[PDB]
């Protein structure tokens, strides 16, 4: 599924991301825009043998198990395929885990490059929430 910004904002809010560990909804929507272009099936296959999965491009070394990655920690306790679902439950819960394990949204390269320090409210502006 390829989300719209406002549709994703509402789904993320229902799943508890708005202000989760101090990160506003706009930060999360912005991160998804630049990580995956809102596409729940996005994949990025890295040369280190890991892969980034789903709308938040969560990586298979630390976070999810794909059975193909060295050094697997599976800290979200899911197969990476769950992160490719059209429903965002597993991706949101794993994103919450990343932050709640002391990572900032710094963990997302696209968030740091493209969202940090900017008017991220623009990404939820005008949306029904």
Q: What is the largest CA-CA distance in the chain?
A: 43
Resolution (A): 0.6
Active-site positions read 35, 52
In order of their start, the domains of the chain are 1-129 (1.10.530.10)
Q: Report the run of H or E that residue 52 belongs to, with start and end.
A: strand 51-53
Q: What is the CA radius of gyration of the chain?
A: 14
CA 112 to chain centroid, in Å, comes to 13
User: What was the structure determination method?
Assistant: X-ray
Q: Report the run of H or E that residue 45 belongs to, with start and end.
A: strand 43-45
Q: Is 87 annotated as belonging to a binding site? A: no
Token pair listed for 123: 């990404």
Instruction: Give residues preceding each break in the chain, C–N over 2.5 A.
Output: none
C-alpha 109/C-alpha 31 separation (Å) is: 9
Q: 36 φ, ψ to 5°?
A: -135, 0
């Amino acid at each position: 599924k390829v989300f719209g910004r406002c549709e994703l904002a509402a789904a993320m809010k229902r799943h508890g991301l708005d202000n989760y560990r101090g990160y506003s909804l706009g930060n999360w929507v912005c991160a998804a825009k630049f990580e995956s272009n809102f596409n729940t099936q996005a994949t990025n296959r890295n040369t280190d043998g890991s892969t980034d999965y789903g709308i938040l491009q969560i990586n298979s070394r630390w976070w999810c198990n794909d059975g193909r990655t060295p050094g697997s920690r599976n800290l979200c306790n899911i197969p990476c395929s769950a992160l490719l679902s059209s429903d965002i439950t597993a991706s949101v819960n794993c994103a919450k885990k990343i932050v709640s394990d002391g990572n900032g949204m710094n963990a997302w390269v696209a968030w740091r490059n493209r969202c940090k320090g900017t008017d991220v409210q623009a990404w939820i502006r005008g949306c029904r929430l």
